[PDB]
Structure formats: C-alpha cells, structure tokens
C-alpha cells in the first residue's frame, strides 16, 4: 500500500449577472480538507481548520501578501472574465438531434453542444408529454461539449407523430425532429 | 457558493508519490489548458484560446511553492496520509452508435483521490494503444478529482470494448464493458 | 493572456 500526501491550491472566481457580482475564493487544501482560505467579501485570510491557523496569521501580518490578494478581484477575476467574453462565453456549438426506438421506448439523443443550458420537450400530435418521460442528467463529455438523452414511454398506434422539441441559446428557432409509427 | 459562471485560475496540484505535479485553468468545469512542466510549454484544449499566451514559468513557480507548502503540512499534521476513495467508472458514446461511422468512446472516472490512476482500453482482451487520449485531473467541489479517457472508434457488432481503471481505492482493477448492440 | 492567482509560502519550513 503506497503512502501519498496531496496539497492543492484553487484560485476560484465566481460571477453572477455578468460583472454585477464578482467573488474570489482562494482555497488551500490538504489533502481533501481545506485548511485556509481568502474570500473577497471579508478582505482578509481566515482559517477553516487548525492546520491553516499558523498560515493565516503569517499572511495577514505581511502587508505585501494582503495587498496583492485584495486587488486579485480586479486583477484575476474581472480581468480574465473580459478575455472569456470574446472566447469561452462566445462559444456556441449547434446540437445534433436523433430519434431511435428502444417498441415501447423512444430516446431523443441531443449530442455535442455548448453552453450547458438546454430545454428539451416531448410531443405527441402537438400535445406535450410530461408523465411518461425520463431524462438522463446533463452528461459532460469533457471536450467542451455536452450531451443529454431523453427517453419516452409510448404506446404507439397508426397515425401518431412523436416530435422532440429542443431549445438552446445557440439557436434563433427551436430544432424539431419527428418520428412516425 | 452560487454563481452563473464558476472559473478556476488555476487548479494547482502537487503530490509526494511521483513527485508529480499539475497546473490547469478551468471554466464551468471544462479544462482551458494544462502546462507541461517537463517540456516547459502551455498546451491549450481549445483552438480559439490559443490566441492568448500563458507563461509556463507561472506554473513552475507555483509548483515550487506547493512543494514547500506540502512538506510544511506533513510536519504539522504528523504525516497524515490521504484517504484512498473508491472511484466511480462509467462508459458511454459521444454520438448515437452507427456501425461503420466514426464515433468516440468516453470512459468517465469520477471521485478519484489520491489523483493517481491508470486508465487503459481493451478490445476483446487485447490492450489498445492506437487512438487514445486523456484529459488532466479535473477538480471537484468536495476537493476530489475526475479524469476522462477517449477512444477513436469505427463500431462493429463482433468488436467488444472494456475500460480498465487501476486505482489503490479498488481491491482489483475495474473493467467497464461497452457493447455497440 | 490570463492572469492567475498565486499561492504563498507556508511558514516553518
């Protein structure tokens, strides 16, 4: 059994309503437990565990460390967000819809899309289905694309049309894929 | 805790096992880039993000500080080793499975701690070395990690695939089977 | 270029 000691540092930036609410949380973790952190709302280092207390007092006493950290909200978060607005926040990936039976089951495969925000509805001859429809949690592919599988318990008969309505921020008009029995 | 967009500038990791280290920048749970500490160069995951130039010296200096911080915490905690957690392995396809059409197999390994894991692909018992790519150790809210492994495919009915995951938290190597059906 | 948050050294070591 090999023994291992892990140390982590996370310079976390939080953004709400664009630039209206900006928060910085600098976390120091050892191993899975956070020992000391710096929050932008308090403007000073505060220990989470007893192990973080000698570090917190050492950094709060030093003027140079405290100065840089209190300015990091505009230097790291607010500056990097301006770079994100024309890069990652501008990224729009068109979703691909596919209907395949599984027939008592019918699954609507919405794959390869960005950002994460998505709303997918099931229809049976212009009437929306809510009771017999199960959705998988928003699956993260990791390569800056998402996928979501939405199944529907259906009892088909002649003349029935099953429409999968999909809404995404990258689309002006929703994509609708139909299936006939 | 609650925000529209959550970013990490950046995820700093250092462990005494290798001694291996990792430096990444995350945005909404997606890896923007990783700094190759050996080759001393920034490797971006998105082509649009390559217009910016991140200095690799930033990561190397942060690792040197994380090396100093890890040794100081081992002495303070009286050599408190990291608890080995049981990882969750799940295998799925990037797009709907079509025999003869190119697809990508994804092996999601969640709740990894300590971040030491060997992920290898196997086809009908034979180990696969061609068409494999892995993402960096992506951080989690509970300060644990998750890694994603990719495999370029051309699905066939007779061709079976398995994802071999080697972790200390597991009693035996976990193999998650995938059938094209 | 993205500006990162810098970790500071731990006393004692």
């Amino acid at each position: 059994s090999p023994e291992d000691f892990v140390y982590q540092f996370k310079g976390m930036c939080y953004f709400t309503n664009g630039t209206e609410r900006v928060r910085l949380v600098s976390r120091s973790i050892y191993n899975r437990e956070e020992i000391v952190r710096f929050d932008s709302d308090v403007g000073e280092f505060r220990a989470v565990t007893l192990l973080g207390l000698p570090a917190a007092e050492y950094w709060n006493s030093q003027k140079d460390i405290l100065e840089r950290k209190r300015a990091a909200v505009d230097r790291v978060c607010r500056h990097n967000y301006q770079l994100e607005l024309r890069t990652t926040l501008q990224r729009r990936v068109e979703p691909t819809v596919t209907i395949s039976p599984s027939h008592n089951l019918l699954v609507c495969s919405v794959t390869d899309f960005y950002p994460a925000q998505i709303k997918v509805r099931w229809f049976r001859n212009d009437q929306e289905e809510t009771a017999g429809v199960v959705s998988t949690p928003l699956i993260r592919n990791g390569d800056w694309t998402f996928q979501i599988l939405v199944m529907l318990e259906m009892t088909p008969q002649r003349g029935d049309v099953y429409t999968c309505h999909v809404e995404h921020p990258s689309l002006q008009s929703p994509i609708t894929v139909e299936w006939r029995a | 805790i609650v925000a529209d967009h959550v970013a990490s500038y950046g995820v700093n990791l250092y462990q005494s096992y290798g001694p291996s280290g990792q430096y990444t920048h995350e945005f909404d749970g997606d890896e923007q880039f990783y700094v190759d500490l050996g080759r001393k160069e920034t490797v971006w995951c998105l082509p649009v993000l390559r217009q910016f130039r991140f200095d690799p010296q930033f990561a190397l200096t942060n690792i040197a500080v994380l090396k100093h911080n890890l040794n100081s915490l081992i002495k303070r905690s009286n050599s408190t080793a990291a608890t080995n957690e049981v990882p969750e392995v799940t295998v799925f396809s990037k797009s709907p499975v079509t025999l003869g059409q190119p697809n990508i197999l994804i092996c999601l390994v969640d709740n990894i701690f300590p971040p030491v894991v060997n992920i290898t692909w196997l086809s009908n018992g034979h180990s696969v070395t061609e068409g494999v790519s892995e993402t960096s150790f992506l951080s989690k809210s509970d300060h644990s990690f998750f890694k994603i492994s990719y495999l370029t495919l051309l699905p066939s009915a007779e061709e079976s695939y398995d994802c071999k995951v080697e972790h200390w938290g597991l009693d035996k190597p976990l193999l998650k089977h995938w059938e094209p059906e | 270029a993205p500006q990162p948050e810098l970790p500071y050294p731990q006393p004692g070591s």
Epitope: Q62, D64, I65, R68, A71, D74, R75, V76, R78, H79, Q82 | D55, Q57, F58, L60, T61, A64, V65, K67, H68 | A1, Q3, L6, Y8, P9, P11
Partner: T-cell receptor, first 109, second 112 residues
Framework: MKTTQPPSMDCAEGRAANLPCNHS???????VYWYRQIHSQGPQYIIH???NNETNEMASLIITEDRKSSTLILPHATLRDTAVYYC???????????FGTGTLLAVQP | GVSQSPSNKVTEKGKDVELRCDPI?????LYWYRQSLGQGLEFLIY????????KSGLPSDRFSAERTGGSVSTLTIQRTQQEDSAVYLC???????????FGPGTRLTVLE
C-alpha cells in the same frame, strides 16, 4: 505595455515634485510601479498602484480614470531626492525589472 | 533589508569570483541582476525556493548561481573577463511576480 516619461526634470527644493508617466497601452491586470536610483547605488522601491490614488510615507501616486497616465508626487523635495526615477508597468508574466530611460530629477538648491 | 557581500571586488582576468546575497526574512524569491554605468538593469538568473526556473539571461557557461539553502544565494563567475566588470545587484520578494527590494550591490572590476 510600455512607459514613456521626460528624460530630465529640474525642481526647486521645498516645493512639491510632480513626475509624469505615460502608459496608454496598459491593461487592467497591470500595476504602476515607481523605483529610484541615486548614481550607481541599489534601486529603491517608492510606491505602486492599480486603479486609484495611493499614499505612502515616501511619496504619493495619482493614476487617471482612463489609467492611460500617472503622476508621482514628492511633497517636501530635498537634495537627497536627486535621483533617476523609473516608472515601470508590472503585471502578468512580468517577473524581471526592466528600466527605461527614466526621469532624472535634479532638485535645485 | 537585503544584504550583499563583498561591497567591492577587484580581481585579475582568469580568476574566479564568488558573490554572496542574503535576502529579507520570509522572502522565498531571489533575483540576480547586472548593471553597467549609464545603462539599464540586465537580468541574469532568479530562484523560487531552491530551484532556478529561468536559467536564461546568463552571458555564458562561466556564469553560475546556487541556492542550496534555500535562503542565501551565491553567484560564481569562473575565468573572469574585462567585459564581466559591472555592479552586480541582488533583489528579493515573498514569491515570484511580487514587489522586489534590492540590496546595496557588489561592484566588480576585472583587470588584465
């Protein structure tokens, strides 16, 4: 980003010394640092700022709203203040002290 | 206050010199600079703890620096030449990209 400042400035002793600095190509994550050097002696740190005005025991720094300009104020200028003043932009990858031409301020007795 | 020893050094060409620098208490980053009369600050090498991330800046293979401590750093110049004559300044900060405070310097003169 780079800084441009006058080569030399003559100021009377006792009067406040205002040293200008131009940095129009500056970014939001960059600081406005000020250093001085008496002949060939070791460079001395004075003050630094990011957004607004800063006040130190040694001098005062006034950064404009547009951040395209900055001014260093030495309230009681003495003969000991006769040095070459460097206005440097520090931010991002910047880890090396790069001195420009500077302003050499000669306080006049 | 950053300390530097010796204050001045007069040597012959081909001789080896050892320049010492003691930084401020708590400062983990050390910086080595070179300065000539009527010219700007020339970067040589810098340390972060005990390791040197940027080896570039050194004029030749003759120039070397060590910080085994890793607190006090020594800059060695073997087989000194007339062109190596300059004021060697040492700077320190709590860690990299932080406010640098300089020492008194070391005036070096190499003669034929």
């Amino acid at each position: 980003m780079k800084t441009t400042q006058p080569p030399s400035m003559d100021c009377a002793e006792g009067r406040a010394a205002n040293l200008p600095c131009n940095h129009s190509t500056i970014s939001g994550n960059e600081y406005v640092y000020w250093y001085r050097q008496i002949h060939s002696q070791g460079p001395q740190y004075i003050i630094h700022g990011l957004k607004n005005n800063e006040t130190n025991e040694m001098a005062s720094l006034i950064i404009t709203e547009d951040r395209k300009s900055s001014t260093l104020i030495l309230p009681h200028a003495t003969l000991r203040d006769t040095a070459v003043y460097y206005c440097i932009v520090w931010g991002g990858a910047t880890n090396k002290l790069i001195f420009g031409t500077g302003t050499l301020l000669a306080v006049q007795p | 206050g950053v300390s530097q020893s010796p204050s001045n050094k007069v040597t012959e060409k081909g001789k080896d010199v050892e320049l010492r620098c003691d930084p401020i208490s708590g400062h983990t980053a050390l910086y080595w600079y070179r300065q000539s009369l009527g010219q700007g600050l020339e970067f040589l090498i810098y340390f972060q703890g005990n390791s040197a991330p940027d080896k570039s800046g050194l004029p030749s293979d003759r120039f070397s620096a060590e910080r085994t401590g890793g607190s006090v750093s020594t800059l060695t110049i073997q087989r000194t030449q007339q062109e190596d004559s300059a004021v060697y300044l040492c700077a320190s900060s709590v860690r990299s990209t932080d406010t640098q405070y300089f020492g008194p310097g070391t005036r070096l003169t190499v003669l034929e």
